[PDB]
Design a protein around this nucleic acid. Structure first.
Lengths: 226, 215
RNA sequence: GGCACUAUGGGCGCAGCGUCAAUGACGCUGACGCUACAGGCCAGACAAGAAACACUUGUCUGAUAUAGUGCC
């Protein structure tokens, strides 16, 4: 486990733009192995993109990227590259580099995987999320517990971090998957349940952290009454 | 003429100690050039089986791969809680390499009714001119549950979107949230907002709701 | 295209020339001879080389692969 692949260079791009992923090998020399790129669209399975083979530098490509993407390795820098040109929207995925293991130890299995970088292809633009409370109700609470939450809306692109009361209160919480909505902006809400006795005794504040727009937002959630 | 690798079932609910098999079928011969990977949400794939039948390292003895012609199968001999993930088959007999579309292997639980919560829009958000109504199904099982949006007892359609969690780690339940989106014009133009939840663990559809400000 | 004929591997001499120094080396060129050993040449399969292709090496199978000279 000194063997490690470290990816970087993803991010958000207009359609037709370009982006250059890089895979940084440490624990092995890259020139003795086949390197592979495997992308994973959000919500879907693994899709193979390209590879380069040792000693010959032969390169191979999926039909879908054949001609726009270009794989390579700088053997002096011990890293592999993927040059993506004229991106299309469905190129959006988490991109993985994988090391093909040794012929006589692991067949053609990919035995060491990257970490993924997210690449998004959108003509949308950055947008921090508007945060609104989901106020706990009249707290009739037959079961002695109420739900309170934060609606995090109209944001782009992903991800979003949501933590309640700065890391405390990791229990009962459910943060939900975001949905793409008609505007082309993502939205999700995070909710926690809690005994409704401490409703007011303890106050609850979700910590919404949206790094892609540099919004670090906190919102207090509580009811409003008469 | 890529080689296709058709994998089934795409989903699978089992409990612990169950035998589980995940078949995959090559549209051409691929010799034994077939690998199996495990993936858990938000992490990288793990190599499990290489050369159609051989375990990679750190794979434990309950996993096993086998071949017959073009029919490859992953087999968990007695399923363990660690083993609920997604599984992909891959062929490496010729380029382009292709994966199976995946099999999701979920835990079998006792049936649990949801606890429904409904949330009006905020005062902040109506100052924004658009209204969102959110309904919360919490810790139910199984996944199947229909949410219906009635406004003044009038069913809605197209104006709502839903999203569910993954199985919980503690108690293997779910949660779903539904969001009705309206114009601020249309939010004020009506008085009763209702969230209809039909579910197996409900002998009769629980429905929660609110009227206007009802302070 | 067919058909013949010949030539094709290593060494070892023989001459002739180059190639670098400028005095020796070093090469090729020779259907130029010398020998017993053999191997070259080409295609396919398989194995290993950090090795899916390519590259290198080895084994195995087929004979092939070149030329030149005739004849059709």
């Amino acid at each position: 486990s000194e063997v490690q692949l470290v990816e970087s260079g993803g991010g958000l791009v207009q359609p037709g733009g370009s982006l250059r992923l890089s895979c940084a090998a440490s624990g092995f020399y890259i020139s003795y192995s086949s390197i592979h790129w495997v992308r994973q669209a959000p919500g879907k399975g693994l899709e193979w993109v390209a590879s380069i083979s040792p000693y010959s530098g032969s390169t191979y490509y999926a039909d879908s990227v054949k001609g726009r993407f270009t794989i390579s390795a700088d053997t002096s820098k011990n890293t592999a590259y993927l040059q993506m040109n004229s991106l299309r929207a469905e190129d959006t995925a988490v991109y993985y580099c994988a090391r093909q293991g040794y012929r006589r130890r692991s067949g053609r299995g990919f035995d060491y995987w990257g970490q993924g970088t997210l690449v998004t292809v959108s003509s949308a633009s950055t947008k921090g999320p508007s945060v609104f409370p989901l106020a706990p109700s009249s707290k009739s609470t037959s079961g002695g517990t109420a739900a309170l939450g934060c609606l995090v809306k109209d944001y782009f692109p992903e991800p979003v971090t949501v933590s309640w009361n700065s890391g405390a209160l990791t229990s009962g919480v459910h943060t939900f998957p975001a949905v793409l909505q008609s505007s082309g902006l993502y939205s999700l809400s995070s909710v926690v349940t809690v005994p409704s006795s401490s409703l007011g005794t303890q106050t609850y504040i979700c910590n919404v952290n949206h790094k892609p727009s540099n919004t670090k937002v906190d919102k207090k959630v509580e009811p409003k009454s008469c | 003429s890529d080689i296709q690798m058709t994998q089934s079932p795409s989903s699978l609910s089992a409990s612990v100690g169950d035998r589980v098999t995940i078949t995959c079928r090559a549209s051409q011969s691929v010799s034994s050039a077939v690998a199996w990977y495990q993936q858990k949400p938000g992490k990288a794939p793990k190599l499990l089986i290489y050369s159609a039948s051989s375990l990679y390292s750190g794979v434990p003895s309950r996993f096993s791969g086998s071949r017959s012609g073009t029919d490859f199968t992953l087999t968990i001999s007695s399923l363990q809680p660690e083993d609920f993930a997604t599984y992909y088959c891959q062929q490496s007999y010729s380029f382009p390499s292709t994966f199976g579309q995946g099999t999701k292997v979920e835990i079998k639980r006792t049936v649990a009714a949801p606890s429904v919560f409904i949330f009006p829009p905020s005062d902040e958000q109506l100052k924004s001119g658009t209204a969102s109504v959110v309904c919360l199904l919490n810790n139910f099982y199984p996944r199947e549950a229909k949410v219906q949006w009635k406004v003044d007892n009038a069913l809605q359609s197209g104006n709502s979107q839903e999203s569910v969690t993954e199985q919980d780690s503690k108690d293997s339940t779910y949660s779903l949230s539904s969001t009705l989106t309206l114009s601020k014009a249309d939010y004020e133009k009506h008085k009763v907002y209702a969230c209809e939840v039909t579910h197996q663990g409900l002998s009769s559809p629980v429905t929660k709701s609110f009227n206007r400000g009802e302070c």
